[PDB]
Design a protein around this motif. Sequence first.
Motif, PDB file in Angstrom:
ATOM      1  N   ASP A   1      34.285  27.272  36.934  1.00 20.95           N
ATOM      2  CA  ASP A   1      33.402  27.727  38.000  1.00 20.95           C
ATOM      3  C   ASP A   1      34.189  28.323  39.161  1.00 20.95           C
ATOM      4  O   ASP A   1      33.832  29.392  39.670  1.00 20.95           O
ATOM      5  CB  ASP A   1      32.540  26.570  38.498  1.00 20.95           C
ATOM      6  N   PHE A   2      35.259  27.651  39.585  1.00 15.34           N
ATOM      7  CA  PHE A   2      36.081  28.179  40.666  1.00 15.34           C
ATOM      8  C   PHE A   2      36.751  29.482  40.248  1.00 15.34           C
ATOM      9  O   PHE A   2      36.903  30.404  41.057  1.00 15.34           O
ATOM     10  CB  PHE A   2      37.123  27.137  41.077  1.00 15.34           C
ATOM     11  N   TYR A   3      37.159  29.573  38.979  1.00 14.30           N
ATOM     12  CA  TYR A   3      37.772  30.801  38.488  1.00 14.30           C
ATOM     13  C   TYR A   3      36.788  31.960  38.525  1.00 14.30           C
ATOM     14  O   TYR A   3      37.159  33.090  38.864  1.00 14.30           O
ATOM     15  CB  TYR A   3      38.292  30.579  37.067  1.00 14.30           C
ATOM     16  N   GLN A   4      35.524  31.703  38.181  1.00 11.05           N
ATOM     17  CA  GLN A   4      34.523  32.764  38.152  1.00 11.05           C
ATOM     18  C   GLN A   4      34.304  33.395  39.519  1.00 11.05           C
ATOM     19  O   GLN A   4      34.186  34.622  39.607  1.00 11.05           O
ATOM     20  CB  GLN A   4      33.199  32.222  37.615  1.00 11.05           C
ATOM     21  N   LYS A   5      34.244  32.596  40.584  1.00 13.20           N
ATOM     22  CA  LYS A   5      34.123  33.152  41.929  1.00 13.20           C
ATOM     23  C   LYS A   5      35.314  34.035  42.270  1.00 13.20           C
ATOM     24  O   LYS A   5      35.141  35.106  42.861  1.00 13.20           O
ATOM     25  CB  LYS A   5      33.989  32.026  42.957  1.00 13.20           C
ATOM     26  N   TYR A   6      36.518  33.603  41.909  1.00 12.85           N
ATOM     27  CA  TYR A   6      37.665  34.490  41.943  1.00 12.85           C
ATOM     28  C   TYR A   6      37.486  35.584  40.893  1.00 12.85           C
ATOM     29  O   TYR A   6      36.713  35.448  39.943  1.00 12.85           O
ATOM     30  CB  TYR A   6      38.953  33.707  41.689  1.00 12.85           C
ATOM     31  N   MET A   7      38.194  36.695  41.090  1.00 11.39           N
ATOM     32  CA  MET A   7      38.169  37.847  40.194  1.00 11.39           C
ATOM     33  C   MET A   7      36.880  38.653  40.322  1.00 11.39           C
ATOM     34  O   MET A   7      36.779  39.746  39.755  1.00 11.39           O
ATOM     35  CB  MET A   7      38.405  37.404  38.735  1.00 11.39           C
ATOM     36  N   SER A   8      35.913  38.169  41.095  1.00  8.18           N
ATOM     37  CA  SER A   8      34.668  38.889  41.322  1.00  8.18           C
ATOM     38  C   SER A   8      34.935  40.275  41.905  1.00  8.18           C
ATOM     39  O   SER A   8      34.154  40.780  42.709  1.00  8.18           O
ATOM     40  CB  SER A   8      33.758  38.089  42.256  1.00  8.18           C
TER      41      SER A   8
ATOM     42  N   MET B   1      35.732  31.776  47.862  1.00  5.10           N
ATOM     43  CA  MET B   1      34.428  31.631  48.504  1.00  5.10           C
ATOM     44  C   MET B   1      34.489  31.903  50.004  1.00  5.10           C
ATOM     45  O   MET B   1      33.443  31.984  50.656  1.00  5.10           O
ATOM     46  CB  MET B   1      33.835  30.236  48.216  1.00  5.10           C
ATOM     47  N   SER B   2      35.681  32.099  50.558  1.00  2.00           N
ATOM     48  CA  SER B   2      35.838  32.418  51.970  1.00  2.00           C
ATOM     49  C   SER B   2      35.059  33.679  52.338  1.00  2.00           C
ATOM     50  O   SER B   2      35.484  34.454  53.191  1.00  2.00           O
ATOM     51  CB  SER B   2      37.319  32.593  52.311  1.00  2.00           C
TER      52      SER B   2
END
Lengths: 106, 44
Positions: free
Chosen positions: B37-44, A105-106
């Motif tokens: 949820d945190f995983y979804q933001k990653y790999m974007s 999110m950074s």
Amino acid sequence: KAIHPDNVVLENDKAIITLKPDGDTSLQNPKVTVEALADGNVKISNGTGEFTMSPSGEIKGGNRGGSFTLQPSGQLMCNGARITTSGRIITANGVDMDDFYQKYMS
Amino acid sequence: NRGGSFTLQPSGQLMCNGARITTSGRIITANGVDMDDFYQKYMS
């Protein structure tokens, strides 16, 4: 038959119930044991595993290949992975979920 | 544990000092972060 010098033993063929004057009580059989000692010790045990509580408030499960341990300070543990009192899920690899989230999110 | 709690609620929601593991296995950490949820933001 022989008599125990000091013990109120209620006994069956292979099932024994022993109460000793010093608080300790115990249920025994050739594959199980449930003892409650004077010093706040509970040691429910079995051949396939055991469960115990220490006087210090610890709660553990002898999975014999695992452990549902709860330490006196309230730090939940399972094979090294910790869940602190504040709910921080510190995985055994040292990664904190909030820390990993912050880099994202950074 | 007197400083901890291996609580299991009737609805099957495992809990430990606030951190929850839902019936579906979602690891909701006490800080509110869901692992998926945190995983979804990653790999974007």
